Amino acid sequence: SMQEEDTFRELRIFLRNVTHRLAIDKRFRVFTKPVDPDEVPDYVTVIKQPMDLSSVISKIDLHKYLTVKDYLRDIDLICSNALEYNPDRDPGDRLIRHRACALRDTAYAIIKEELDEDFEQLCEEIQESR
Ligand SMILES: [Cl-]
């Protein structure tokens, strides 16, 4: 229905705003764009489902997220990709891991404070009905 379309449009606007707040934080610059296969030719070979915040925006705009739970699975991938690709004790790896954990924690904290649980429940039930 059009009311359901209105619900998903409000979801899209909410997710666009959370993603923009993450993308303008200087800590998260490395997560804003895909990894350049020049700088890092092994990336695409190690990480099978690359994800970054620009890809998340394109997904929102393609109507790929019908719930905040699905959006958070992609935020979780940005985090787990960096834990897998940068697992060493050296400070460059530790700094990327801490930034990727902080991204994830920040997205979950904004959602805890600003997502109404009944709005998420509605999205989940429309999705499950499709
Ligand atoms: Cl830096």
* Centre of ligand 1 from the C-alpha of residue 128, in Å: 42
Q: Smallest Cα–Cα separation from 45: which of 56, 32, 35?
A: 35
Q: What's the gap in Å between 9 CA and the centre of ligand 1? A: 35
Strands (E), the chain: none
Closest CA to 130 of 2, 4, 3, 14: 4
Q: Residue 44: which CATH number?
A: 1.20.920.10
Residue 23: phi, psi to the nearest 5? -70, -25
Cα→Cα distances 117→11, 19, 51, 86, Å:
12, 19, 26, 34
Residue 121 CA to ligand 1 centre (angstroms)? 39
**Radius of gyration in angstroms for the set of CA atoms belonging to the chain, rounded to a whole number:** 16
Domain count of the fold of the chain: 1
Model resolution, angstroms: 1.4
CA angle 60, 96, 71 (to 5 degrees): 20
Range of the domain at 103: 1-130
